[PDB]
Ligand binder design. Structure first.
Ligand code: A3P
Ligand code: NPO
Length: 295
């Protein structure tokens, strides 16, 4: 009721970055967020594998036992730093204040507005990047179903906004390059969604090592089995089916939508693809960061 006036509103702006309308009021709760050195941040541009990696991390911290990951939904096990639903739920920052170390913190904030406390405390950041074409498709369908978002209109107009960095959380180009460069002065494990599709066990192993956790072969296989797309799609703890329909209309588009690399080929027109490829090449010249659009 009270949150309704924030839903389906145009983006607000915080520190020059487009922001979900409901999340933007009382930004100081974010700017002044009190982190701990043991915090683990799962940071992504939206729709790049946040939930996937969050479940992997929580599974690793539970020793590979899926029962401890079924006791609550992932939205509560891994709170989103900047989440807010004024008048209906506590903010993510308030929920995190009460959680025991090691806290797992999800965020989509670009590196330059991630709260300074994280950088000062050297907090381990696991960043996940995904190729921009698949991200755009996933984010468009997410905005169709998620009522916190401004309505995206048609796909062609959404794609123009995406390429120009007008969507919530800003420019994908700036986001992925910012955390790629920031690893110079901070402990960051920079993962690729496409690598995880190619060889999930290889990436789980890298996450475990970054976190200092040793996995038996049995625990590694258990985590890989429980973090397949099919498993996470059918798991009520990870598939977001417990979110009220007035916030996420799962009938419009499910959260666990397709889970592949290359769905952009089913949405980009021949013209859109050529135009996107030409712009992307200009915007990504001068970084060594590279993404795969097919595996
Ligand atoms: N175990 C998994 N394996 C492969 N893809 C997964 C996955 N879990 C979620 N995904 C996909 O990651 C996207 C959600 O990303 P995020 O958690 O950052 O919001 C969605 O992509 P699609 O819309 O392309 O299906 C979701 O289907
Ligand atoms: O991950 N999330 O829950 C999100 C991501 C993007 C957004 O605009 C709102 C919510």
């Amino acid at each position: 009721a009270t949150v309704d006036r924030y839903l389906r509103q145009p983006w607000s702006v915080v520190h020059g970055i487009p922001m979900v309308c409901a999340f933007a009021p009382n930004w100081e709760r974010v700017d002044n967020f009190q982190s701990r050195p043991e915090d683990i941040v799962v940071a992504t541009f939206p729709k790049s594998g946040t939930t996937w990696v969050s479940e992997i991390v929580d599974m690793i911290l539970q020793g590979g036992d899926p029962e401890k990951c079924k006791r609550d939904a992932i939205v509560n096990r891994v709170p989103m730093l900047e989440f807010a639903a004024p008048g209906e739920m506590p903010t993510g920052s308030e929920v995190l204040a009460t959680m025991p170390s090691p806290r797992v913190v999800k965020s989509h904030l670009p590196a330059h507005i991630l709260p300074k406390s994280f950088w000062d405390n050297g907090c381990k950041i696991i960043y996940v990047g995904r190729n921009a074409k698949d991200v755009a498709v996933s984010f468009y369908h997410f905005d169709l179903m998620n009522k916190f978002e401004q309505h995206p209109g048609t796909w062609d107009q959404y794609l123009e906004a995406f390429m120009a960095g007008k969507v919530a959380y800003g420019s994908w180009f700036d986001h992925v390059r910012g955390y790629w460069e920031r690893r110079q002065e901070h402990p960051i494990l920079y993962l690729f969604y496409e690598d995880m599709k190619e060889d999930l066990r290889r990436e789980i192993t890298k996450v475990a090592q970054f976190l200092g956790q040793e996995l038996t072969e049995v625990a590694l296989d258990a985590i890989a089995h429980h973090t397949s797309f099919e498993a996470m799609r059918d798991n009520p703890s990870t598939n977001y089916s417990t979110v009220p329909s007035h916030l996420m209309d799962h009938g419009v588009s499910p959260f666990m939508r397709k889970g592949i690399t290359g769905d952009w080929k089913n949405h980009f027109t021949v013209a859109q693809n050529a135009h996107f490829d030409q712009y992307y090449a200009q915007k990504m010249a001068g970084t060594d960061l590279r993404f795969r659009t097919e595996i």
